Ligand binder design. Structure first.
Ligand SMILES: Nc1ncnc2c1ncn2[C@@H]1O[C@H](COP(=O)(O)OP(=O)(O)O)[C@@H](O)[C@H]1O
Ligand SMILES: Nc1ncnc2c1ncn2[C@@H]1O[C@H](COP(=O)(O)OP(=O)(O)O)[C@@H](O)[C@H]1O
Lengths: 262, 134, 123, 114, 120, 291
């Protein structure tokens, strides 16, 4: 009986209407991929009781082993997983950087699309911010513990505030995507994440770079990553920010999943 | 049509930990009455109908082979204690489920699991130091 | 019967936000009209924010507070009443920091009261 | 104009607001933008395009002007268009919105009894 | 060696509980929760032996406060007894490995937050 | 049995009265302290009386339940006798019942629980009386200025045109008694060690509730209070802080003797006595007969 399903003419696939926000659904598949690995991020990462295909029990916190055992069937999630596989090429770390960062770019993109900003304009902002991040990263081995993620966010947020036009909305959200990584370290350590971001921005406002999250259960304060000896690799952050943005942009460019047959 | 799980059953957060805490208490109840020399016996029947009566905690866990994921952790830990020592599997099994029971209401109140681990790692070393001193 | 917990604040937000979404388009000289189905099948095509909410039935007490505060505005000032409900609904519509971030209302209220002293000075 | 003019003051003043209160403090500023958001929606002009340029004018040019024309939809200075409203109406409109939002936020249990 | 019958478990419950008070923070309730968990060893020995765990544990925990260090549960007589003088001993290193394996086993369960299952 | 009414017995009757008193407490739990949140009161007509005062809520709170009405009759006893502390009474009595109900599940008879709570209130009043400060520090000392200063700081005046005896408040009494009564429980025994211990743990709800209302981590602040108070018990050395209270604004413990956060002695004494008598009155109820 009419009116049936709207915009459904290709093999009866689940085509979300204009009200159902087909783009919003492919993003939700990627956000769920981050929550499966957002908790395993950092030294206090939570282990996963993985059950192998041979009915074998393994308790681990490695991202590559989680995804290799988790049969990811959604194609929108496979793209981010393919970036993790491409992350393994040219570097052997930063896998969860691709999952956590890309999940924040897509999660924050929904706040822009909901306002009414076009998906093609959101992509131009992330591509501009990725190019801007590669110029700021040499100025920052780089500090870890979420230190670069706040400074790189602070430097990119200022570029978006002075840049007029519509690209500033996606450029600012590109900076807030970096904040998800300190928020992951704080949540996995049992600390109010908003208090970590508030302190990390204050010390960076005073110019105290190289300051990261002090990993401690009973101390939500911060410390210098240089004095403690915590350091990350430059190419690990370079190729992670690059592949994560391409995976997020590649998902945003897609608006409809369609079946086929040879 | 297009879903992420497609048979992949998964749950996360506080409900998963609370589910494992309750599953660990089941292994405790199976060896709770056998603690001590005068502990109650346990009757176990294999597939062939052959009976097995024994009040040893280690022998009981070998015959159960519980399929729950969290329960296998205690069984493999208790089995290792039997191979290395041959005694104390019931004390290890009961204390583990009891550490989990006491922190159960705090986990429900929003206390992070990692803060609980720092307490066990801290309280354990203080206890081991008190044993050698006394 | 009664409401308790986080369901109350998120519920009061949806009630106040819903009352503001009615009269979002009733602002300005190019205001849009509204169709009020009377119980006898009649229609009133008014575009006055005070008249619309006066005739609408509300079940949530939060909506009654929003409407009753608007009536107090009309007695003092016969203009800008529609701006009160829209701003009050938009200030409450930001439920990210309210519940999803698990901030206490006293933290939010202290910020809203700090901004109000700054909004007054800037005007 | 008064909404966007006030919102720029809070956003610039929130930069020196160390703490977690900066986030809701800035959210109030973005809430004032809804007033021109509705004036632009009614005229039919693009909301994001004009509201974006509208905020840029308050940054560079003086904040006392460069509002929105509800009839035409384009931007216009209030010195050129007599849309000047009183102060007592806006102050009481701003207090009643915050005082009302503070009220409903202070409610945590809808209880029955007499 | 140390006194068996749960005597050492009650002494640690006194030390950790009195130590938790001097530890400000979230570790206070947890180290105290760790202490009460040690009560199960002398408790089930009373419950399995048909004794009243309340009257023994209260009489046992009171003795450790006054200066007791080896008093514990007597499965034969329904009363407390100095398990060291009664030659009810156990190896200290075997008891040390029990607490370590217990906490290490509980930590593995507490550190877990999600279970993953390949569909097969 | 055939009757002209209905009857219901068992342990579930205790639980039903426990969950009822616990419900009435949650209606006035978040509104505890000066930073308490307001609450609506939808009358039968439709009026909405909005207020945060716990006494004003209980006068207008109408819950048709016997156990709840016992706490309403209890409120009048505290209001007339003193005129304050009614909110802490209903909250303290609710936690004693929720904790006692757990003991009853451990085969602890209510008579043994009623005996423990009576002895705990007696010793608590003794420890309170031994740790008072008489009405003094009027002139030449500063047992006032800091009291009035902290009270007026809420308004714009805070910058600097158009009772015979008192006790440190802010959970200092409830935190100090948490350590003393827990140690006193180890001395008595005889099926009362657990009840006096649960009486000790129940008092921590007051600093735990005041911390939640102040937008702070209650688990940490409650632990910090008990640590400074426990160190006072270990030795009387001056390095160990004493009589440390709870500051709601700064979210940190503070010595109330300097801050001037004082309360009458009869409040903490009567509130513990009336709350204990209320939980005793409900714990003795093991059956219900309707007609
Ligand atoms: N000891 C530490 N203190 C603070 N931060 C750390 C520490 N160890 C690792 N990190 C942070 O955790 C992040 C992930 O590290 P790693 O586990 O090596 O990569 P992946 O999570 O991709 O496997 C890094 O960006 C680093 O900043
Ligand atoms: N000609 C106009 N151009 C732009 N904005 C206008 C114009 N007339 C009114 N407004 C805006 O509409 C809002 C509501 O005005 P008014 O209708 O007088 O009050 P109310 O809506 O409360 O009755 C005012 O805040 C004002 O800024």
């Amino acid at each position: 009986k009419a009116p049936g399903f709207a915009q459904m003419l290709k093999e009866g696939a689940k085509h979300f209407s204009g009200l159902e926000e087909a783009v919003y659904r492919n993003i939700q598949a990627c956000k769920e991929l981050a929550q499966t690995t957002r908790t395993a991020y950092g030294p206090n990462g939570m282990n996963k009781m993985v059950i192998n295909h041979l009915e074998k029990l393994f308790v681990t916190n490695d991202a590559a082993t989680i995804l290799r055992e988790l049969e990811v069937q959604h194609p929108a999630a496979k793209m981010i997983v393919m970036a993790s596989h491409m992350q393994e090429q040219e570097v052997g770390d930063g896998t969860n950087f691709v999952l956590v960062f890309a999940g924040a770019l897509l999660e924050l993109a929904e706040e822009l699309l909901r306002i009414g900003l076009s998906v093609s304009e959101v992509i131009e902002g992330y591509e501009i911010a990725c190019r801007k991040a590669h110029e700021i990263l040499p100025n920052l081995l780089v500090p870890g513990g979420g230190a670069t993620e706040i400074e790189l966010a602070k430097q990119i947020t200022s570029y978006g505030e002075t840049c007029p036009g519509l690209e500033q909305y996606a450029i600012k959200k590109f900076a807030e995507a970096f904040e998800a990584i300190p928020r992951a370290l704080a949540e996995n350590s049992g600390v109010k994440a908003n208090e970590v971001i508030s302190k990390l921005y204050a010390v960076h406002q005073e110019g105290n770079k190289n300051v990261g999250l002090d990993i401690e259960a009973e101390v939500p304060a911060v410390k210098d990553m240089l004095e403690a000896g915590i350091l990350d690799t430059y190419l690990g952050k370079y190729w992670a920010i690059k592949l994560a943005t391409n995976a997020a942009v590649t998902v945003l460019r897609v608006d409809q999943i369609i079946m086929a047959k040879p | 049509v297009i879903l992420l799980k497609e048979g992949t059953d998964s749950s996360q957060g506080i409900p998963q930990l609370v589910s494992n805490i309750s599953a660990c208490q089941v292994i405790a109840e199976a060896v709770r009455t056998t603690l001590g020399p005068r502990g109650m016996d346990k009757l176990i029947v294999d597939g062939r109908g052959k009976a097995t009566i024994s009040n040893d905690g280690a022998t009981i866990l070998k015959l159960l082979d519980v399929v729950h994921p969290a329960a296998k952790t205690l069984v493999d830990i208790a089995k290792s204690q039997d191979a290395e020592v041959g005694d104390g599997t019931t004390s290890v099994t009961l204390l583990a489920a009891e550490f989990l029971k006491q922190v159960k209401p705090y986990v429900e109140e929003g206390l992070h699991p990692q803060i609980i681990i720092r307490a066990f790692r801290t309280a354990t070393q203080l206890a081991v130091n008190k044993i050698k001193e006394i | 019967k009664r409401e308790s917990g986080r369901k109350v604040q998120s519920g009061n937000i949806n009630a106040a936000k819903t009352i503001a979404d009615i009269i979002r388009t009733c602002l300005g000289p190019k205001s849009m009209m509204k169709m009020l189905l009377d119980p006898m099948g009649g229609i009133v095509m008014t575009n006055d924010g005070n008249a619309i909410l006066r005739e609408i039935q509300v079940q949530h007490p939060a909506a009654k507070s929003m409407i009753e505060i608007s009536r107090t505005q009309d007695e003092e000032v016969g203009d800008g009443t529609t701006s009160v409900i829209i701003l009050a609904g938009e200030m409450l519509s930001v439920a990210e920091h309210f519940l999803e971030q698990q901030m206490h209302p006293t933290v939010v209220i202290s910020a809203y009261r700090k901004a109000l002293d700054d909004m007054i000075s800037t005007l | 104009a008064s909404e966007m003019a006030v919102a720029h003051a809070l956003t610039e003043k929130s930069k020196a607001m160390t703490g977690v209160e900066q986030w809701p403090y800035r959210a109030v500023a973005q809430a004032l933008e809804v007033i021109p958001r509705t004036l632009i929606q009614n005229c039919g002009a693009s909301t994001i395009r004009l509201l974006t340029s509208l905020r840029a004018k308050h940054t560079q040019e003086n904040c006392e002007t460069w509002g929105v024309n509800g009839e035409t939809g384009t931007l216009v200075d209030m010195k050129e268009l007599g849309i000047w409203e009183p102060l007592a109406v806006k102050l009481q409109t701003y207090k009643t919105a915050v005082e009302t939002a503070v009220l409903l936020l202070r409610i945590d249990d809808i209880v029955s009894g007499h | 060696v140390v006194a068996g019958g749960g005597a050492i478990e009650m002494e640690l419950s006194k030390y950790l509980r009195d130590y938790s008070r001097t530890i400000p923070g979230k570790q206070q309730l947890l180290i105290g929760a760790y202490a009460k968990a040690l009560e199960i060893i002398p408790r089930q020995l009373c419950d399995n032996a048909g004794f009243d765990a309340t009257n023994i544990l209260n009489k046992l925990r009171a003795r450790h406060a006054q200066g007791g260090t080896w008093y514990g549960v007597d499965i034969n007589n329904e009363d407390i007894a100095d398990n060291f003088e009664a030659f009810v001993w156990e190896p200290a290193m075997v008891r040390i490995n029990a607490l370590t394996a217990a906490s290490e086993a509980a930590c593995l369960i507490v550190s877990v937050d999600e279970t993953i299952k390949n569909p097969r | 049995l055939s009757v002209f009414g209905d009857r219901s017995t068992g342990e579930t009757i205790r639980s039903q009265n426990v969950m009822a008193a616990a419900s009435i407490a949650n209606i006035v739990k978040s509104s505890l302290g000066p930073v308490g949140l307001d609450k609506m009161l939808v009358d039968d007509i439709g009026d909405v009386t909005i207020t945060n005062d716990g006494a004003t809520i209980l006068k207008l709170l109408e819950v048709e339940h016997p156990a709840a009405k016992v706490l309403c009759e209890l409120a009048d006893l505290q209001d007339k006798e003193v005129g304050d502390g009614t909110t802490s009474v209903v909250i303290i009595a609710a936690e004693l019942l929720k904790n006692a109900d757990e003991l009853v599940k451990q085969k602890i008879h209510p008579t043994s629980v009623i005996s423990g709570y009576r002895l705990a209130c007696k010793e608590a009043v003794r420890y309170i009386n031994e740790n008072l400060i008489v009405n003094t520090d009027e002139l030449g000392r500063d047992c006032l200025i800091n009291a009035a200063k902290t009270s007026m700081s809420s308004k714009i005046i805070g910058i600097n045109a158009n009772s015979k005896s008192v006790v440190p408040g802010g959970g200092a009494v409830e935190a100090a008694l948490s350590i003393y009564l827990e140690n006193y429980a180890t001395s008595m025994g005889s099926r009362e060690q657990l009840a006096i211990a649960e009486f000790a743990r129940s008092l921590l709800v007051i600093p735990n509730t005041l911390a939640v209302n102040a937008a702070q981590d209650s688990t940490d602040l409650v632990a910090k209070l008990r640590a400074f108070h426990n160190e006072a018990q270990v030795n009387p050395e001056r390095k160990n802080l004493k009589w440390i209270g709870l500051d709601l604004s700064n979210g940190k413990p503070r010595d109330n003797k300097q801050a001037g956060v004082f309360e009458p002695t009869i409040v903490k004494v009567k509130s513990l006595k009336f709350a204990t008598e209320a939980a005793i009155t409900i714990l003795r109820i093991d059956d219900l007969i309707k007609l």
